Amino acid sequence: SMSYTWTGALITPCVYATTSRSAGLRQKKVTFDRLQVLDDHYRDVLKEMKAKASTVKAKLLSVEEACKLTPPHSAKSKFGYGAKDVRNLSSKAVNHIHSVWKDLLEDTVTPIDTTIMAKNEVFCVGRKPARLIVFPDLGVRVCEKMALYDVVSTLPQVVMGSSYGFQYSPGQRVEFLVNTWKSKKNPMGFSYDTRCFDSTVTENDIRVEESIYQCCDLAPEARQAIKSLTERLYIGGPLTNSKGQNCGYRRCRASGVLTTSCGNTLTCYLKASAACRAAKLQDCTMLVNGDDLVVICESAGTQEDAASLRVFTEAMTRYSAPPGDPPQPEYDLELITSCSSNVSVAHDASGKRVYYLTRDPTTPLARAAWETARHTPVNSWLGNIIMYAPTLWARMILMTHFFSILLAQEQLEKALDCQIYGACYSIEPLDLPQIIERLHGLSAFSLHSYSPGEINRVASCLRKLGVPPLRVWRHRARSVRARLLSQGGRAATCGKYLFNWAVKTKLKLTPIPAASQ
Ligand SMILES: CC(C)(NC(=O)c1ccc2c(C3CCCCC3)c3n(c2c1)CCOc1ccccc1-3)C(=O)O
Numbered sequence: 001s002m003s004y005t006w007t008g009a010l011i012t013p014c015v016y017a018t019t020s021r022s023a024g025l026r027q028k029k030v031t032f033d034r035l036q037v038l039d040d041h042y043r044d045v046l047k048e049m050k051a052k053a054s055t056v057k058a059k060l061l062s063v064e065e066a067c068k069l070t071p072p073h074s075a076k077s078k079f080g081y082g083a084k085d086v087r088n089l090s091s092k093a094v095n096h097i098h099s100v101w102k103d104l105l106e107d108t109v110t111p112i113d114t115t116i117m118a119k120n121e122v123f124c125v126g127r128k129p130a131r132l133i134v135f136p137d138l139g140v141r142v143c144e145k146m147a148l149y150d151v152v153s154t155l156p157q158v159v160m161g162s163s164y165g166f167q168y169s170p171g172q173r174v175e176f177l178v179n180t181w182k183s184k185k186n187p188m189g190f191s192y193d194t195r196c197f198d199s200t201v202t203e204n205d206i207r208v209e210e211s212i213y214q215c216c217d218l219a220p221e222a223r224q225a226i227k228s229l230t231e232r233l234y235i236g237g238p239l240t241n242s243k244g245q246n247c248g249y250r251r252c253r254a255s256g257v258l259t260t261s262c263g264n265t266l267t268c269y270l271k272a273s274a275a276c277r278a279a280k281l282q283d284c285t286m287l288v289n290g291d292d293l294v295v296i297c298e299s300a301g302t303q304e305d306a307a308s309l310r311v312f313t314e315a316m317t318r319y320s321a322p323p324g325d326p327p328q329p330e331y332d333l334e335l336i337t338s339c340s341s342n343v344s345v346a347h348d349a350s351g352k353r354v355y356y357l358t359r360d361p362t363t364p365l366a367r368a369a370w371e372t373a374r375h376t377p378v379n380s381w382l383g384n385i386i387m388y389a390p391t392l393w394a395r396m397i398l399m400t401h402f403f404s405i406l407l408a409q410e411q412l413e414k415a416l417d418c419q420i421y422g423a424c425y426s427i428e429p430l431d432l433p434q435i436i437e438r439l440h441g442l443s444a445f446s447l448h449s450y451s452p453g454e455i456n457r458v459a460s461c462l463r464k465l466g467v468p469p470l471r472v473w474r475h476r477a478r479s480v481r482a483r484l485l486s487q488g489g490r491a492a493t494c495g496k497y498l499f500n501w502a503v504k505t506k507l508k509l510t511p512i513p514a515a516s517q
Contacts, residue, residue, distance in 0.1 A: 009241060014117045020130065023132065036318070036319060050212060053212045066149065068087065074138055078137055086142060093139075104232075111232055114136050117242060118132060119133055123363060124465065145258060160265070165265075170357055170387065177336075178355050190309060195324035196324070198255055272286060274319065337359070379418050392450045397462075401476075415427060478503065481503065
């Protein structure tokens with residue numbers, strides 16, 4: 001069936017940014033008839049998964065638990081309250097959510113409304129159209145957590161095991177990839193890019209996902225709500241623009257429901273697993289985060305692997321998940337990008353090899369540049385500093401430049417909102433040494449001798465963007481550093497740890513103590 005049907009009603013508004021002006025380009029991209037044919041490989045895998053699901057027990061969250069787990073900056077309800085009101089258990093929001101939950105149990109058919117908007121996201125320049133998000137009202141969102149919050153995390157882990165990527169901290173991901181890679185005699189890996197994965201998700205895919213939830217041991221009321229949410233919301237429904245006008249109907253995954261991530265993870269794992277069997281990949285290990293898929297297996301030979309991947313892709317396509325980028329076999333782990341990252345090697349103080357996650361700095365640099373400029377309530381630069389703390393480009397460029405700006409504006413102690421790892425943290429910049437040491441270990445203040453590919457990518461990327469060479473940054477760093485040290489206190493600690501790389505004569509970096517008093 002068609003992933004979308006449109007009524008012509010415009011999708012109205014809520015280095016460049018995406019806007020509603022390109023919504024037409026995306027709609028054309030995401031709108032197509034899906035054809036899905038399933039075979040015994042798919043059925044065999046689904047049965048194995050259901051058997052694992054059958055061992056999971058999961059519980060209803062009360063209205064209050066679900067409110068407390070509601071993120072602070074969610075789009076407000078059209079029923080007179082917003083995310084802060086939910087977090088604060090205001091009577092207004094509490095009363096409405098109870099009415100919404102009751103209606104979910106008593107009505108299991110009436111399509112639930114959703115809003116569609118185009119995202120505003122910053123990119124560097126072939127310009128990409130804005131992403132479309134589809135989401136139900138805040139009240140419904142909280143009820144989703146009541147029914148399914150205890151499901152959507154626990155369940156995929158049990159079903160998929162080490163393949164479920166969301167269980168891993170950043171160092172655990174690296175560890176899993178490197179160990180998997182080193183366990184093959186002749187490793188071959190490839191990422192698989194599904195073309196607009198959300199649009200490829202069929203009604204059958206979504207009823208399958210529901211059938212897998214129900215394999216869980218649930219409360220009766222939870223089964224009812226999960227069935228209802230599926231029928232009224234998940235499988236499809238009407239789309240409303242920001243103006244209150246209907247602009248079409250959906251028959252695929254909505255991007256902004258609680259089950260988007262769990263569901264894409266299960267369905268991607270299910271389809272890919274079966275496709276591995278169809279292709280006869282040997283000693284397969286998969287890693288899955290939602291729609292993002294990477295496979296590492298035992299090489300059968302250069303042309304064999306190429307043929308294998310083409311048969312892999314044919315299976316995924318039959319299963320309704322056709323490739324955006326045709327997949328490509330790699331024989332070097334560094335060259336495999338999954339979840340916008342790749343493993344790379346450097347050396348620590350004693351010259352030990354340290355693997356860490358890095359990525360092409362283009363988008364992080366562009367967004368940070370954008371945030372310097374227009375002073376946005378969004379601080380993506382700080383999140384990138386944390387996520388990619390060990391990297392060449394985060395240490396020498398982003399840290400240097402932003403601690404530079406923090407000093408000048410004397411903002412060293414103003415906490416910034418930071419959305420990372422699926423949560424919104426209130427981050428004080430002086431905490432960065434302690435944060436980094438926990439996430440990445442001390443080696444992250446001491447890494448040197450980065451790979452030639454990594455260095456080339458960074459230096460080349462800077463040139464493309466008109467950013468000063470790394471040499472400029474090392475010089476600026478030494479200045480920012482001395483300023484931090486001179487101020488002493490927590491500022492000094494930042495100079496000592498975050499910038500010991502810019503200095504000839506290294507200070508000794510010892511384990512930073514937890515807070516006292
Ligand atoms: C001319 C010179 C040498 N420039 C700088 O010092 C300088 C510092 C930081 C940055 C940055 C960012 C680096 C990462 C943190 C956010 C800003 C970017 N650019 C500069 C140029 C060049 C133009 O604007 C950009 C557009 C896209 C990506 C990066 C940038 C001067 O001294 O005036």
